[PDB]
Write a protein that binds this ligand. Structure first.
Ligand code: HEM
Length: 467
């Protein structure tokens, strides 16, 4: 009674038929089997959903049913799978971490207060960007967008006041994320073949506990050191960051959260906003460089609003209606997560007549719906003009665009993502002219796909500022 899919082979099921870079294969197989597919990844049953109306059935109509999360083995490291807001069933401790996220830390009231903590972090990059232009060196966009992202998240969370782009604090964080991504970003057969779960054959759960213990040790030091600063100054001026808010929650003791609940929350906030922004800023700074007709419309717009100001204030978003679309088009073409984050059917539920069993990992292919010929016309072409004078937005209600998810577990970092994805892009676009470090380059590198935590270019984007 389940959705249609290819013949499950013994044991392996449909885990050899995927080929390399599965996101496209889960898309092409949908043209024969349908929007609701059934792929037997080993023992892990999985339903692929690749159409807006079906994503509406999954995330909204039956959303409270499909509101779980498939948990990976690396997530059990340091008991993260039982503390994190990302991978907990919708419950008492999760509702608190949402109402805390959306209403206090990610509402506009806190975004506008954290506006000044992040401009300094763009200036450090813009000054470093000018460093590579004088001697005429090339800038690794991924490297530059990662360190800037950590400096951006660390300022929003901790209010670190370093004077160096590659500060000592930031590079301790950079290794651990890249170490975690190198762990989760590769397949762990314990997830698909449960008899291997006790053994942990590839040693994934262990190696994750090492880096998780480090990333949580550095977060602890930033908590206990603030408590003493909170004790020394009783009328301490409210820091306009996320950590100060979190300290002000367990001192009032209104909600029902522990201390480890907050530590692991800052981890998810830190990790969740780093490698996503890092990849999803490499794309626009490639799309605009690969299609110079469109960068020209962005620059001429930016010069119309900036004036002589050389850093983009996140409050000038409404006056950049084209950069809003340029990101929107990058959301459609190259979504950061090709299959988003796995959902789980917490109850036997029927969708479109087919039965979806309990514990069915529902992957919402956002890559296909970005290149589905039935939705966007000429989908394989970059064109931010299709979003001009269009209310289609990635807020979750336009299932034609689901890069940030929708339903009950929508991305809580959306207001912080777009203010980042726009400013750190509009600061490199408005200030310099870019050209590929290698114009005689294989197009396999351009729009290349790397399956892992997020899909990114096959080769890190390396361009030069020559103005
Ligand atoms: C920059 C682009 C980003 C993308 C494309 C992205 C993507 C996603 C997706 C697809 C989901 C799951 C949605 C669903 O299952 O329906 C999610 C959830 C989540 N994201 Fe992001 N994210 C981004 C940035 C961020 C940022 C900046 C933060 C934190 C500051 C963050 C933290 C989280 C957390 C904690 C969750 C768990 C939500 C829950 O389980 O209720 N992400 N994200």
């Amino acid at each position: 009674k389940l959705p249609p899919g290819p013949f499950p082979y013994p044991i392996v099921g449909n885990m050899l038929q995927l080929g390399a870079q599965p996101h496209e294969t889960f898309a092409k197989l949908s043209k024969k089997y349908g929007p609701l597919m059934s792929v037997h990844l080993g023992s892990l049953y999985t339903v692929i959903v690749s159409s807006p109306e079906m994503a509406k059935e999954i995330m909204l109509k039956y959303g409270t049913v499909f509101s779980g999360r498939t948990v990976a083995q690396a997530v059990h490291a340091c008991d993260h799978d039982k503390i994190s807001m990302g991978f907990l069933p919708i419950g008492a401790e999760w509702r608190d971490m949402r109402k805390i996220c959306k209403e206090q830390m990610f509402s506009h009231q806190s975004m506008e207060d954290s506006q000044g903590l992040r401009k300094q972090k763009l200036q450090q990059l813009l000054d470093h960007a000018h460093r590579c232009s004088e001697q005429g060196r090339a800038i690794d966009i991924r490297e530059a967008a990662f360190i800037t992202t950590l400096n951006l998240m660390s300022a929003t969370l901790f209010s670190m006041q370093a004077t160096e782009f590659d500060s000592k604090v930031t590079m301790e964080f950079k290794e651990i994320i890249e170490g975690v991504a190198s762990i989760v970003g590769v397949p762990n057969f314990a997830d698909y073949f449960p008899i291997l779960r006790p053994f942990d054959p590839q040693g994934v759960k262990r190696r994750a506990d090492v880096y998780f213990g480090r990333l949580l040790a550095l977060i602890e030091g930033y908590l206990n050191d603030r408590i003493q600063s909170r004790k020394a100054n009783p009328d301490a001026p409210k820091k306009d960051d996320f950590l100060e808010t979190l300290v002000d929650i367990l001192n009032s003791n209104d909600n029902k959260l522990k201390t480890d609940h907050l530590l692991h929350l800052m981890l998810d906030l830190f990790v969740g906003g780093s490698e996503t922004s890092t990849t999803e800023i490499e794309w626009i700074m490639e799309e605009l460089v690969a299609h110079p007709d469109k960068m020209a419309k962005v620059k001429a717009e930016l010069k119309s609003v900036m004036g002589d100001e050389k850093v983009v204030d996140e409050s000038l978003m409404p006056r950049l209606p084209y950069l809003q679309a340029v990101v929107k088009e990058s959301m459609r073409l190259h979504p950061p997560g090709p299959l988003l984050l796995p959902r789980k059917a917490e109850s036997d539920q029927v969708v479109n007549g087919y039965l979806i069993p309990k514990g069915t990992q529902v992957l919402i292919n956002a890559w296909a719906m970005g290149r589905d010929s039935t939705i966007w016309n000429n989908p394989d072409a970059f064109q931010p003009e299709r979003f001009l004078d269009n209310k289609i937005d990635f807020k979750g209600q336009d299932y034609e665009l689901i890069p940030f998810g929708s339903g009950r577990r929508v991305c809580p970092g959306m207001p912080l993502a777009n203010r980042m994805l726009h400013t750190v892009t509009a600061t490199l676009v408005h200030n310099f002219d870019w050209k590929l470090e290698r114009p005689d380059a294989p197009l396999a590198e351009h729009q290349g796909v790397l399956f892992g935590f997020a899909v990114r270019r096959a080769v890190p984007l390396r361009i030069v500022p020559y103005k």
